[PDB]
Design an enzyme around this catalytic site. Structure first.
Site: not given
Length: 490
Positions: A444, A447-449
């Site tokens: 996560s 590369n997600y938040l």
DNA sequence: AAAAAGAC
DNA sequence: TGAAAAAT
DNA sequence: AAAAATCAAAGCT
């Protein structure tokens, strides 16, 4: 580098750069055949082979222990491809691998391995620094005004394609890429890398309208491959940087979006309904886009739009809750998404409707593909697309955690733990060494938040960033750091 | 409109 | 990202 | 001293 690309002007779109200079790739080191001591077999009949087939065989040889080799479909893929990689003679005699013996071959490599895992400090040391040398002349192109590191100059070595899940193409041989297979992406003015002796490049162009400095099409899936820069690199960053800016914007313009779809649940046009639902799902369940895949060369995995009916079951009452939708299916890389989620009656009943008269194999959201789903989104917001959402709820739900599970008085060490506990809650929806030995690492985070969030939090509480982010990962966010104040709100 | 090629 | 190698 | 615990495939004519 101390480079502040963000602190610098905005690019005129499309245009990636003005200048670019790189030394081409690093072709896979050629095959050095097995010495007479180490040999083959086949019905005991120890018999040498063609170098081509040799190397090919070695591949298999280096995975006999691996379950792949124990995989039937995988094997067929091997056998057949192999044949092609050898002489008629050989081809004639080896009518059966189910009589071959790579065991010996396995041994050598494992040996050579333990050997390598025994090589002298000084001996290897040479290579260590030697290998380092390579980078300096092969790991840093020249773009616009700075020298950045590339992802990987070393070209993908030939081999045996490993396909996640029941890939129908697993076991097929990859292949050794030649200069004749390469496309250089330069900048007519820059020193174009001279192709290795005798050989010529496939093609060479300068489309500064793209990223990658070099690329080629892989054979297996007949898909393109490319060598692009590093994450710390501006190019690779700005996209990601503005990537969050996007979610940052649906954030406002969303409640509205929601009303629309919930409203859309009562529509007259089927597709309109089909759509709204999908969004809803993705919205909540954070399902992925769901691109349609070619039923054959592909490894059957569904997605929100690509969901088939058999993938779900509906329970009007269950586990104490009403209108329950039971999700089961394998997503990306065939990772089974099993779930029991309670939904809005209308969805339920609509779902119930989407199923009516269909075969298990029938696509759940018939009259609906990803393209459509996004086309809609686009009109609702510029650049709106399915991806955006996962990215959204992710960095947002988080944004609150470090607001909740965080204690004012709390000590750093504690605070730290307090932090990690926040992220737990996050992956709580994506369905993604004591209590954890099954859950993945960064993923996560990877590369997600929006990191800006993590940053302003460290600031707002005085947390030495290094603690949560190492150099390499801090290197990637080398901006979010610099450009951020505890007063940051995604 | 639609299959193909591409790019990140 | 995932599988895999590597850094008492 | 040793042993053990911490790259590339898949998916916006």
């Amino acid at each position: 580098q101390k480079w502040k690309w963000w602190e610098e002007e905005r690019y005129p779109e499309g245009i990636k750069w003005k200048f670019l200079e790189h030394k081409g790739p690093v072709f896979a080191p050629p095959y050095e055949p097995l010495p007479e001591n180490v040999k083959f077999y086949y019905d005991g009949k120890v018999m040498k082979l063609s170098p081509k087939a040799e190397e090919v065989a070695t591949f298999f040889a280096k995975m006999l222990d691996h379950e792949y080799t124990t995989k039937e479909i995988f094997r067929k893929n091997f056998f057949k491809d192999w044949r092609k990689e050898m002489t008629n003679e050989e081809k004639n005699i080896i009518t059966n691998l189910s009589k071959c013996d790579f065991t010996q071959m396995s041994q050598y490599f494992k040996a050579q391995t333990e050997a390598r895992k025994q090589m002298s400090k000084e001996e290897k040391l040479k290579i260590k620094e030697e290998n380092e040398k390579l980078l300096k002349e092969y790991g840093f192109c020249i773009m616009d005004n700075h020298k950045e590191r590339i992802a990987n100059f070393k070209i993908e070595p030939p081999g045996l394609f490993r396909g996640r899940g029941n890939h129908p193409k697993m076991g097929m041989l990859k292949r050794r890429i030649m200069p004749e297979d390469i496309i250089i992406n330069c900048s007519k003015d820059a020193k174009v890398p001279s192709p290795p002796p005798g050989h010529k490049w496939k093609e060479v162009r300068h489309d500064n309208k793209v990223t990658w400095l070099v690329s080629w099409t892989e054979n297996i899936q007949g898909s393109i491959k490319y060598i692009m820069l590093n994450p710390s690199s501006r190019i690779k960053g700005e996209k990601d940087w503005q990537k969050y800016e996007t979610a940052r914007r649906l954030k406002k313009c969303v409640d509205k979006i929601r009303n629309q779809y919930r409203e859309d649940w009562k529509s007259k046009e089927m597709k309109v309904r089909q759509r709204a639902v999908a969004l809803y799902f993705i919205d909540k369940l954070a399902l992925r886009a769901g691109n349609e895949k070619e039923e054959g060369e592909t490894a059957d995995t569904v997605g929100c739009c690509s969901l088939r009916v058999e993938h779900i079951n509906l329970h009007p009452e269950l586990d104490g809750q009403e209108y329950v939708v039971e999700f089961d299916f394998l997503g990306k890389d065939s990772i089974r998404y099993y779930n029991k989620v309670p939904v809005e009656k209308r969805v339920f009943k609509n779902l119930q409707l989407f199923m009516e008269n269909k075969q298990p194999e029938d696509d759940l959201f018939d009259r609906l593909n990803t393209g459509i789903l996004n086309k809609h989104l686009q009109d609702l917001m510029e650049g709106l697309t399915a991806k955006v959402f996962r990215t959204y709820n992710a960095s947002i739900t988080l944004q609150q955690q470090l607001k909740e599970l965080t204690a004012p008085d709390e000590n750093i060490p504690a605070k730290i733990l307090s932090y990690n506990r926040a992220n737990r809650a996050v992956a709580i929806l994506c369905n993604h060494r004591e209590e954890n030995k099954q859950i993945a690492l960064g993923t996560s985070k990877l590369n997600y938040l929006d990191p800006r969030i993590t940053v302003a939090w460290c600031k707002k509480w005085g947390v030495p960033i290094e603690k949560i982010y190492n150099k390499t990962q801090r290197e990637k966010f080398a901006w979010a750091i610099d450009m951020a104040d505890e007063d940051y709100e995604f």
